[PDB]
């Protein structure tokens, strides 16, 4: 089975250049088409270009023609996507995809469709600097329905870049947990909200701690949420 392994996530400033790698293992490398497809957050798939390594023939999408460079290195069985003049709208997940075949090696028969995909590579282009988030408590209302259901949570605000992972009570609390997709604020920093609904009866006794983890900034914050003493 063909397997594609891409390079790690990238954080770049506007105007710079990035190079994402796609190392192929298993199957044959030279005779099958290797394409690159990007996908902006919450958007669809977009074909950027492709290359047949053994032919040294690359085909680019008109939208990227001039700014993009796709290469194939047969000595390392590794394809490369190079994107220059980066702008904030280039922020996306870049996938490398290879067409499938019916058989093995060079006399394998190509099907054209992208049957094999890489794990994807997050490329974030911004003027913002890498920052750990500030985690504020979304405290449970002091008007929570007695003997009913109350909602509480944590606001993970002003961080860069994506992603952030949030758990509750170190993974012990999973029922009723909603970690929302992050929004990109006008300041250039990300922010998301993670809530959970619990019995109101538990509000005065049970400890609720959200565990916020931001790998890109090496940040780890455990925040305790409790009713406001009003």
């Amino acid at each position: 089975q063909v397997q594609l392994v891409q390079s790690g996530a990238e954080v770049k400033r506007p105007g710079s250049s990035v190079t994402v790698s796609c190392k192929a293992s298993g199957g044959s490398f030279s005779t099958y088409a290797l394409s690159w497809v990007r996908q902006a957050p919450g958007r669809g798939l977009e074909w950027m270009g492709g290359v047949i390594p053994l032919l040294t023939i690359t085909n680019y999408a008109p939208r990227f023609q001039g700014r993009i460079t796709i290469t194939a290195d047969r000595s390392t069985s590794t394809a490369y996507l190079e994107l220059n003049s980066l702008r904030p709208e280039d922020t996306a997940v870049y996938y490398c995809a290879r067409e499938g075949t019916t058989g093995w090696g060079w006399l394998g028969k190509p099907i054209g469709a992208f049957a094999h995909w890489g794990q994807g590579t997050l490329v974030t282009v911004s003027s913002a600097s890498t920052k750990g988030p500030s985690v504020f408590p979304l405290a449970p209302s002091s008007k929570s329905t007695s003997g009913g259901t109350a909602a509480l949570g944590c606001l993970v605000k002003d961080y860069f870049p994506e992603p952030v992972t949030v758990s509750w009570n170190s993974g012990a609390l999973t029922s009723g947990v909603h970690t929302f997709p992050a929004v990109l604020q006008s300041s250039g920093l990300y922010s998301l909200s993670s809530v959970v609904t619990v019995p109101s009866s538990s509000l005065g006794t049970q400890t609720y701690i959200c565990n916020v983890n931001h790998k890109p900034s090496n940040t780890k914050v455990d925040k305790k949420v409790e009713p406001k003493s009003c």
Binding site: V37, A115, A139, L155, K157, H178, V183, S193
Partner: protein
């Protein structure tokens, strides 16, 4: 350039039903080089159909492809729980390959009203000079909901951002989070903070509010 248009945008169906997705090409797709991909959140796309009708090994037979020329169709004979995802069509009959805008297949369920909660900015955040008011719309269906911010009963606009969760795997509901962002000064200029929620499952708009400092 061949432009692919998928229909409909969203397909709301119950498990066990027959799903039919349409892909319409701007011009004839030479050599029927049409493919169907499935993508779930957090994962790469997965090839379902190639050559308009051919199905790779490992892909369930309930997925079938048909059509030619400019009209193509992906058919799921019976909708299983893992089939509710996003589906893309792709043409590769030209040197310039293109994707469709995609179709999301969601679980159709009984209408559920949102549980609305409001959260004032914490003292810790107020110490930093900014104030974030959070409105939570918990577990509702359908996805279409409207959130309106009222400050001293004045309609706010362009100072709030919202995000919606993926359809829940258990109760097939959605949850929405709306954040109203102000400076500490602008926040301390007013008293009444309210979030008004309009939804199909609500006979009348539900308003959750608080007074600053109380």
């Amino acid at each position: 350039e061949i432009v692919l248009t998928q229909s409909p945008g969203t397909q709301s169906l119950s498990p066990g039903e027959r799903a039919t997705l349409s892909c319409r090409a701007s011009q004839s797709v030479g050599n029927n080089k049409l493919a169907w991909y499935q993508q779930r959140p957090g994962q790469a796309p997965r090839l379902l159909i190639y050559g308009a009708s051919s199905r790779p090994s490992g892909v369930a037979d309930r997925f079938s492809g048909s059509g030619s020329g400019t009209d193509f169709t992906l058919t799921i004979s019976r909708l299983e729980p893992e089939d509710f995802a996003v589906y893309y069509c792709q043409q590769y009959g030209q040197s310039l390959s293109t994707f469709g805008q995609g179709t999301k297949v969601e679980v159709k369920r009984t209408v559920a009203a949102p549980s609305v909660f409001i959260f004032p900015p914490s003292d810790e955040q107020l110490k930093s000079g900014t104030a974030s008011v959070v409105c939570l719309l918990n577990n509702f269906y359908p996805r279409e909901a409207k959130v309106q911010w009222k400050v001293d009963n004045a309609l706010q606009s362009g100072n709030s951002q919202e995000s919606v969760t993926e359809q829940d795997s258990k109760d097939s509901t959605y949850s929405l989070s709306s954040t109203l962002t102000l400076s500490k000064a602008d926040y301390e200029k007013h008293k009444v903070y309210a979030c008004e929620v309009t939804h199909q499952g609500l006979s009348s708009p539900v308003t959750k509010s608080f007074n600053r400092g109380e």
